[PDB]
């Protein structure tokens, strides 16, 4: 199939973090997840594009799930770097329609629900931590749920994996929150605001104020509060990973979680978050000897990163008691 | 505890920097069987390569080598090669060969018999067509993969289907050998050896040595890229072969060299340094370092990362560019 | 349990190398080994503290196994960095007393035997290679034996693991010897001598003489002799590791052994041992694509490190033949 070849070309051209682990998935999961990735990428590209007015955008978000069944549908007006997935959408939708119906049902349901949620947030910033969870559920939690439903529908994993939507949602939330935290500065420069207003406003008058070097102390305090919030999903991440029985699915799920945890640990109490590039420095000697492909190794890696954070908690930090508590819970 | 076997492991380690440790890690009877297979093929290789041995002396040595396995006093004292201790003390090696179970002797002798004929056939001639390149690689490397695969299955650590699949075992060997030949252009040219297929190189230059000259660099790189594209064709068979394996020790032994060869092709792709000496197999991307080459899905993911490392660098102007994209695309969708 | 939470806090704060792998252990092994670590660390903290007189220290070491059973016992006079495990010992011992009886038997047995052995060595240095094994047995071999007994008691591993005490002892001796070899200079400036006198005295008048630049050739020869001694434990290490069936136990056991082997290879015939800290080099290409989490990979990594030593054995070294011989035995087995 030349259209499937094109889809895999687009996957590799677009995804640095997931292309390899997706292409390594066993059997039918590989095409189902490749197509799921591309279709959500097309949806995201619409969401992100500030040249599409809110009034024009909402009906596209709302109806995107149905465009999967309109063989000629494409979008030619995107100004985004990845617009090829929208311009050549018929190639992707054709391959979506070639998936077994059980996978189509999952992918279309997720697109529909994600479209509704993305549309809700076009006109508003994130206010409370509860709203943060809602926004993250819409753009990432639902991805974890959809992937889990595909794993179960394929029979490569237990039915519990797709049924336990709270655990799957946590998988997505941990990744999205980590990205939001790490990307403060890049988002500030693109005029984007994802840090929850009810948290940041306790520190500064404007979210952009964290980029000013005179506010670095308060910035790092807010940073630490948000990291503490994200750490709450780690028990569910461990539970989720602990239930997987397929090696290719385990690799696909575990590697990105471990990269996120590494990233949160590097960002903890780190002024660099507000100043530029934060790179992961190599871990404890013991954990360098293992990779993230069996559960005891993944747990050890996670515990090492939790101690890297725990060790750095400033007594003066306003979240310090809470940071110790969640880490202690993760350890329990 | 056997002094002759101890000596064979000494020779394995004197000669092999990169296979010895994974051979020694093999389960049960495969360990000795593959150690001995390595040393016997090493002795044959040393004869093939020794340019001080006249062709008319060399042909019978290569043809009859499999017979020497059953001649307890046979040795060869006239080699000038660096690995000649395996020929000079061949009786120690053949003694340990004759201590192997018959099922392993049968495989090893059969491969030696067939390899000797193939090696003898190529003494007077260079590789012309790509089909001849496959034939030569079959004789000196494909047959190694086939022999190993038959040893795995004879030991019963692997399913009989592993030894049965001679076509994909052959591809495993071809992939490694073509990678080596590609990488070692310059070392070979300085030793007066020509392994690049004439039907390919002669479309660029008048002599193969012409690629060593700095004025021919663009052409040399184009030919390099054409040969790499040829070698990438074995990757689907490599993936299928490795996917069938069920023994961890066998898996590590087979998968690690394939991944290293893919890493080598990626470092060599479109790389002028091939014609100036040694190519540094670089450090890979973030996702790559998160996994090792010891389970099949991780091996697949590593392979795909390297395929994208090549794909991203294909120059539009390269004469093989659509073909390189095509084979990578096939590997991705398999 | 807030006391169990505290024990894990102490585990993470103290153990840079073992906290993560301990916490990753399956089922009942996790608490059993976390507690085993904390109590042995407490015992070690008493042993190490040069401000505690021998008069006071002997009864502390002898009676330590019984303090596990005395709910109010603590020690408030430590001047060591890790004194919290001593000052808050009742928290650790409460959790100890909550372990299954089968685990308590093992932990208290090792604490009793280690305390006795540690006390023997307060008044003396290590003389013979046999005394070196005895000392390492007391402070590391018994840890290997205790851990192996916990694995078998938990039934995550076969009975053989805890039964074969010689193999478990070798696991401990290999680590301990590697550490002592590596740490020559740091111990020399701490006023500590662990290199066996019957070996070093064949080279120099005083152990500290190896730190003097003019003595470097003799120092390196002695280093190589001791390395050769430690390599004799590798067959047992391979036998031990090859018997493990549990992934979490395998990770916990194999990684330290591989790091020790890498360290010995980095130290072999290396003058830097006597000038400070030794760089553990980037490994041979084939091994860089493997981790230490399955047995064939661990074998290949160990075998590769053996060849790195072998390659470096110079003919003029007085132990050269012995070093080749042990490596040759490990290759062929
Ligand atoms: C659009 C989406 C992602 C856009 C994205 O853009 C990048 C870019 O434009 O550059 C990207 O292309 C790149 O970085 O190359 C990247 C990629 O690599 O894929 O893709 C990025 O990946 C990460 O950020 C990963 C971060 C943690 C794993 C690691 C730590 C370090 C921080 C947590 C991501 O930002 C998602 O959809 C929605 C609705 O969000 C998927 C389609 C959902 C899905 C995922 C898997 C299967 C199926 C569907
Ligand atoms: C003679 C032969 C090889 C000569 C060879 O000479 C080298 C040298 O002369 O120096 C070598 O000695 C060295 O490098 O030390 C080396 C070695 O290491 O063993 O041996 C080399 O190998 C590698 O380097 C391999 C590296 C991978 C890990 C990654 C690569 C493939 C990425 C590109 C190889 O060139 C074969 O016989 C024939 C007929 O070919 C074997 C006996 C066949 C066999 C193999 C296995 C089991 C049984 C039999
Ligand atoms: C006191 C003890 C340890 C003192 C120790 O102090 C360090 C410090 O004070 O800094 C330490 O805390 C640190 O370095 O952080 C450290 C740690 O990491 O735990 O702990 C150190 O360990 C390593 O570095 C080991 C590195 C290998 C993985 C690789 C090496 C062998 C390559 C050469 C160690 O010196 C033992 O008891 C006795 C009686 O000795 C345990 C309790 C015994 C036990 C072990 C496991 C389970 C149960 C019991
Ligand atoms: Mg059991």
Inter-chain contact A23–B300, Cβ cutoff 8 Å? yes
Phi, psi of B277 (to 5 degrees): 155, -120
Active site residue B332: no
How remote is the CA of residue C155 from the centroid of ligand 4, in Å? 5
* C248 within 8 A of C150, measured Cβ to Cβ: no
Q: Which residues of A touch C258 (CB under 8 A)?
A: 289
Phi, psi of B302 (to 5 degrees): -60, -50
Tokens of C209: 């003489």
**C-alpha Rg value of chain A to the nearest Å:** 20
- Confirm or deny that C279 is annotated as ligand binding: yes
Residue keyed to tokens 């004197």: B14
Q: Which residues contact B281 (CB under 8 A, 6 or more apart)?
A: B260, B263, B264, B267, C285
Q: What is the DSSP letter of A137?
A: I
For residue B115, give the ligand 2 atom closest to its CA: 39
Active site residue A252: yes
Pocket of ligand 3 contains residue C63 by CB under 6 Å:
no
How remote is the CA of residue C61 from the centroid of ligand 4, in Å? 35
* A304 within 8 A of C11, measured Cβ to Cβ: no
Who surrounds ion ligand 4 at CB < 5 A?
Answer: C 155
CA angle (B189, B195, B197) in 5-degree steps: 120
CA C6 – CA C93 distance, rounded (Å): 12
Q: Which of A36-39's residues contact partners 24+ apart within 8 Å by CB, and which partners?
A: A36/A107, A36/A110, A36/A146, A36/A147, A36/A150, A37/A11, A38/A7, A38/A10, A38/A11, A38/A14, A38/A85, A38/A92, A39/A68, A39/A92, A39/A93, A39/A96, A39/A107, A39/A111
CA C73 – CA C86 distance, rounded (Å): 9
Question: Taking the mean position of all CA atoms in its chain, how far away is CA B322?
Answer: 27
Q: Which residues of B touch A291 (CB under 8 A)?
A: 290-292, 298
Tokens of C24: 């990753």
For residue C286, give the ligand 2 atom closest to its CA: 28
B246, B259, B290, best to mutate vs chain A, most A CBs in 10 Å: B290
CATH topology assigned to domain C1-333: Farnesyl Diphosphate Synthase (1.10.600)
CB atoms under 10 Å from CB of A50, counted, come to 12
Inter-chain contact B249–C331, Cβ cutoff 8 Å? no
- Which is catalytic among the residues B76, B104, B136, B152? B136
Dihedral of alpha carbons C242, C244, C247, C250, sign: negative
* B303 within 8 A of B235, measured Cβ to Cβ: yes
Element (H, E) at B267: helix B248-268
Among C275, C289, C237, which residue's Cα sits nearest to residue C259? C237
CA A33 – CA A37 distance, rounded (Å): 6
Measured from the alpha carbon of residue A14, the closest ligand is: 1
* C269 within 8 A of C315, measured Cβ to Cβ: no
Q: Which residues contact B20 (CB under 8 A, 6 or more apart)?
A: B12, B13, C303, C307
CA B248 – CA B24 distance, rounded (Å): 13
Which residues, numbered 286 to 305 in chain A, qualify as contacts with chain B under a Cβ-Cβ cut-off of 8 Å? 291-293
* B236 within 8 A of B330, measured Cβ to Cβ: yes
How far are the Cα atoms of A275, C8, C46, C47, C78 from residue C75, in angstroms, in the given order?
47, 20, 9, 13, 7
Q: What is the DSSP letter of A139?
A: I
- Which is catalytic among the residues B183, B195, B204, B306? B183
Dihedral of alpha carbons B155, B160, B161, B166, sign: positive
* B83 within 8 A of B46, measured Cβ to Cβ: yes
- Experimental method, per PDB record: X-ray
**Size of chain A, expressed as the number of residues it contains:** 332
Measured from the alpha carbon of residue A81, the closest ligand is: 1
CA C113 – CA C110 distance, rounded (Å): 5
How remote is the CA of residue B19 from the centroid of ligand 2, in Å? 7
Question: Taking the mean position of all CA atoms in its chain, how far away is CA B192?
Answer: 20
Q: What is the DSSP letter of C164?
A: -
* B188 within 8 A of B179, measured Cβ to Cβ: no
- Name the residue at shortest CA distance from atom 34 of ligand 3: C15
Instruction: Please return the burial class of A59, using the count of CB atoms within 10 Å of its CB with bins 0-12, 13-18 and 19+.
Output: exposed
CA A318 – CA B2 distance, rounded (Å): 70
Residue keyed to tokens 């184009």: B222
- Name the residue at shortest CA distance from atom 17 of ligand 3: C15
Helices (H), chain A: 2-14, 19-23, 27-48, 54-67, 84-87, 89-97, 101-120, 129-136, 142-154, 159-163, 165-182, 184-189, 197-200, 216-231, 234-242, 247-267, 285-288, 295-312, 320-331
Tokens of B76: 């060869």
Q: What is the DSSP letter of B265?
A: H
Among C139, C168, C155, which residue's Cα sits nearest to residue C257? C168
Instruction: Please return the burial class of C151, using the count of CB atoms within 10 Å of its CB with bins 0-12, 13-18 and 19+.
Output: buried
What is the CATH class of A1-332?
A: mainly alpha
Inter-chain contact B22–C284, Cβ cutoff 8 Å? no
CA angle (B236, B331, B135) in 5-degree steps: 40
CB atoms under 10 Å from CB of A256, counted, come to 20
Among A178, A54, A57, A162, which residue's Cα sits nearest to residue A110? A162
How remote is the CA of residue B242 from the centroid of ligand 1, in Å? 30
* A168 within 8 A of A152, measured Cβ to Cβ: no
Active site residue B193: yes
* A289 within 8 A of C290, measured Cβ to Cβ: no
Burial code of A275-292, b = ≥16 C-beta within 10 A, e = fewer? Answer: eeebeeeebbebbbbbbb
Tokens of B98: 């004759």
Instruction: Please return the burial class of B281, using the count of CB atoms within 10 Å of its CB with bins 0-12, 13-18 and 19+.
Output: middle
3-state secondary structure of A81: coil
Pocket of ligand 3 contains residue C205 by CB under 6 Å:
no
Among A244, A255, A237, A243, which residue's Cα sits nearest to residue A326? A237
Among B178, B183, B177, which residue's Cα sits nearest to residue B275? B183
- Name the residue at shortest CA distance from atom 29 of ligand 3: C256
Measured from the alpha carbon of residue B285, the closest ligand is: 1
Among B270, B62, B109, B241, which residue's Cα sits nearest to residue B169? B241
Query: DSSP per residue over C48-70, as a string?
Result: H-TTS-HHHHHHHHHHHHHHTT-
Dihedral of alpha carbons B99, B104, B109, B115, sign: negative
A287, A289, A312, best to mutate vs chain C, most C CBs in 10 Å: A289
3-state secondary structure of B181: helix
Tokens of B122: 């190529």
* C22 within 8 A of C37, measured Cβ to Cβ: yes
User: Could you state, in order of their start, the residue ranges of all structural domains in chain C?
Assistant: 1-333
3-state secondary structure of B87: helix
3-state secondary structure of A276: coil
* B165 within 8 A of B244, measured Cβ to Cβ: yes
Burial code of C256-278, b = ≥16 C-beta within 10 A, e = fewer? Answer: bbbbbbbbbbbbbbbeebbeeeb
Query: DSSP per residue over C267-329, as a string?
Result: HTT-GGGGTS----PPPPGGGGG--SSSHHHHHHHHHHHHHHHHTT--TTSTTHHHHHHHHHH
Query: Crossing angle for the helix pair C216-231 and C247-267, nearest 10 degrees?
Result: 150
How far are the Cα atoms of B205, B224, B313, C114 from residue B268, in angstroms, in the given order?
20, 8, 11, 58
Among A215, A214, A5, A186, which residue's Cα sits nearest to residue A95? A5
How remote is the CA of residue C245 from the centroid of ligand 4, in Å? 9
- Name the residue at shortest CA distance from atom 11 of ligand 3: C15
* B140 within 8 A of B177, measured Cβ to Cβ: yes
Q: Which residues contact B103 (CB under 8 A, 6 or more apart)?
A: B154
- Name the residue at shortest CA distance from atom 5 of ligand 2: B16
B292, B296, B298, B302, best to mutate vs chain C, most C CBs in 10 Å: B292
Inter-chain contact B297–A248, Cβ cutoff 8 Å? yes
* C288 within 8 A of C270, measured Cβ to Cβ: no
**C-alpha Rg value of chain B to the nearest Å:** 20
Residue keyed to tokens 């797709």: A162
Inter-chain contact A12–B304, Cβ cutoff 8 Å? yes
* A171 within 8 A of A198, measured Cβ to Cβ: no
* CB-closest option in B295, B302, B304 to A19: B304
- Which is catalytic among the residues C96, C184, C252, C305? C252
Pocket of ligand 3 contains residue C263 by CB under 6 Å:
yes
Tokens of C111: 């604490």
* C199 within 8 A of C284, measured Cβ to Cβ: no
Among A229, A215, A196, A329, which residue's Cα sits nearest to residue A274? A215
How many CA atoms lie less than 13 Å away from C240 in the CB half-sphere? 30
Q: Which residues of A touch C4 (CB under 8 A)?
A: 332
Q: Does domain B1-334 have CATH number 3.30.465.10?
A: no
CA A105 – CA A65 distance, rounded (Å): 10
Tokens of C58: 């002997």
Inter-chain contact B290–A9, Cβ cutoff 8 Å? no
- Confirm or deny that C177 is annotated as ligand binding: no
How many CA atoms lie less than 13 Å away from C143 in the CB half-sphere? 23
* A169 within 8 A of A237, measured Cβ to Cβ: no
Q: What is the dihedral of CA B127, B129, B130, B136, to 10 degrees?
A: -30
Longest dimension (CA), chain A: 61
Question: Taking the mean position of all CA atoms in its chain, how far away is CA C226?
Answer: 16
3-state secondary structure of A202: coil
Q: Which residues of B touch A248 (CB under 8 A)?
A: 296-297, 300
For residue A142, give the ligand 1 atom closest to its CA: 39
> CB-based contact (8 Å) between C23 and chain A?
yes
Among A303, A298, A267, which residue's Cα sits nearest to residue C17? A303
Among A80, A101, A95, which residue's Cα sits nearest to residue A9? A95
Helices (H), chain C: 2-14, 19-23, 29-48, 54-67, 84-87, 89-97, 101-120, 129-136, 142-154, 159-163, 165-182, 184-189, 197-200, 216-231, 234-242, 247-267, 295-310, 320-332
Resolution value in angstroms: 1.9
CA C16 – CA A217 distance, rounded (Å): 29
* C310 within 8 A of B9, measured Cβ to Cβ: no
- Confirm or deny that C149 is annotated as ligand binding: no
């Amino acid at each position: 199939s030349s259209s499937l070849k094109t889809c895999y070309k687009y996957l590799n051209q677009t995804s640095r973090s997931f292309a390899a682990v997706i292409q390594a998935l066993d059997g039918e999961m590989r095409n189902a997840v490749c197509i799921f990735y591309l279709v959500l990428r097309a949806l995201d590209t619409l969401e992100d594009d500030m040249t599409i007015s809110v009034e024009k955008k909402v009906p596209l978000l709302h109806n995107f799930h149905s465009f999967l069944y309109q063989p000629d549908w494409r979008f030619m007006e995107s100004k985004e770097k990845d617009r090829q997935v929208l311009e050549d959408f018929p190639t992707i939708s054709l391959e979506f329609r070639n998936l077994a119906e059980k996978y189509q049902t999952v992918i279309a349901d997720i697109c529909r629900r994600m479209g509704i949620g993305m549309a809700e947030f076009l006109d508003k910033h994130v206010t409370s931590e509860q709203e943060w969870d809602k926004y993250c559920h819409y753009v990432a939690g639902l991805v974890g749920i959809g992937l889990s439903r595909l794993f179960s529908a394929s029979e490569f994993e237990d039915p519990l994996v797709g049924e336990d939507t709270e655990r799957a949602n946590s998988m997505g939330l941990f990744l999205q929150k980590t990205n939001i935290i790490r990307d403060y500065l890049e988002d500030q420069q693109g005029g984007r605001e994802f840090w929850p207003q009810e948290v940041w406003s306790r520190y500064v008058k404007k979210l952009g104020d964290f980029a000013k070097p005179e506010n670095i102390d308060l910035a790092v305090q807010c940073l630490n509060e948000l990291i503490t919030n994200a750490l709450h999903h780690i028990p569910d991440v461990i539970t989720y990973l602990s239930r997987l029985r397929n090696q290719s699915v385990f690799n696909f799920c575990a590697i990105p979680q471990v990269m996120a945890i590494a990233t949160l640990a590097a960002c903890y109490n780190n002024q660099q978050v507000f100043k530029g590039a934060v790179k992961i420095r190599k871990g404890q000697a013991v954990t360098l000897m293992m990779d993230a492909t069996n559960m005891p190794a993944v747990k050890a890696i996670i515990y090492q990163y939790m101690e890297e954070i725990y060790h750095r908690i400033p007594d003066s930090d306003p979240s310090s008691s809470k940071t110790r508590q969640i880490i202690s819970t993760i350890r329990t």
